[PDB]
């Protein structure tokens, strides 16, 4: 899994996350943005965070 800071494609003065991507595709990652929704965020609105370590 890759983890990302994200901005929403249609808003955004603050970075959100980092969040674990649920899936990756060409030019976008599927990011949880609420308790009931995920959004395909284009790369230009993502920053790759370091992966956290299992406990």
Residue numbers in the entry: 10 to 20, 22 to 65
Paper text:
IN first catalyses 3′-processing of the vDNA ends, exposing reactive 3′ OH nucleophile groups that it uses to attack a pair of phosphodiester bonds within target DNA (tDNA), resulting in strand transfer. In this work, we determine the three-dimensional structure of the deltaretroviral intasome and characterize its interactions with its host factor, the PP2A-B56γ subunit. The deltaretroviral IN host cofactor B56γ14, as part of the heterotrimeric protein phosphatase 2A (PP2A) holoenzyme, interacts with a number of chromatin-associated proteins and potently stimulates concerted integration activity of deltaretroviral INs14.
To aid the interpretation of the cryo-EM map, we generated a high-quality homology model of the STLV-1 IN/NTD using the SWISS-MODEL server, and determined a series of X-ray crystal structures spanning the catalytic core domain (CCD) and the C-terminal domain (CTD) of HTLV-2 and -1 IN. The IN/CTD structure was determined in isolation as well as in complex with B56γ. While the canonical IN/CCD dimer observed in crystals could be docked directly into the cryo-EM map, the CTDs could only be docked as monomers. We speculate that the dimers and trimers observed in IN/CTD crystals may be relevant within viral particles prior to vDNA synthesis by reverse transcription.
